[PDB]
């Protein structure tokens, strides 16, 4: 697996989600880095995992999660 952007929307609002779901992101093996836009409800997870793998750990922060594309 190769290091790519995946540009996914979720389920937040509030300014305390969009950071647990910062720090449940943080320290994966497989992600280089992250950029999250609470304003576009939207996750960038710079990473070299599947997407499917992607979208069940943002799943693990108690939300759901749709993906957009690549970046
Ligand atoms: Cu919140």
Redesign the pocket.
């Known amino acids: 697996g190769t290091l790519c952007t995946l540009e996914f929307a979720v389920q937040?609002?509030?300014?305390?989600?969009?950071d647990?779901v910062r720090k449940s992101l943080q320290g994966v093996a497989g992600v280089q880095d992250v950029e999250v836009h609470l304003e576009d409800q939207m996750v960038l997870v710079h990473t070299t995992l599947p997407s499917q793998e992607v979208q069940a750990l943002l799943e693990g922060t108690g939300r759901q999660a749709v993906l957009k594309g690549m970046g």
Not at 12 to 18: K, L
């Open positions: 937040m609002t509030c300014q305390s989600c969009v647990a």
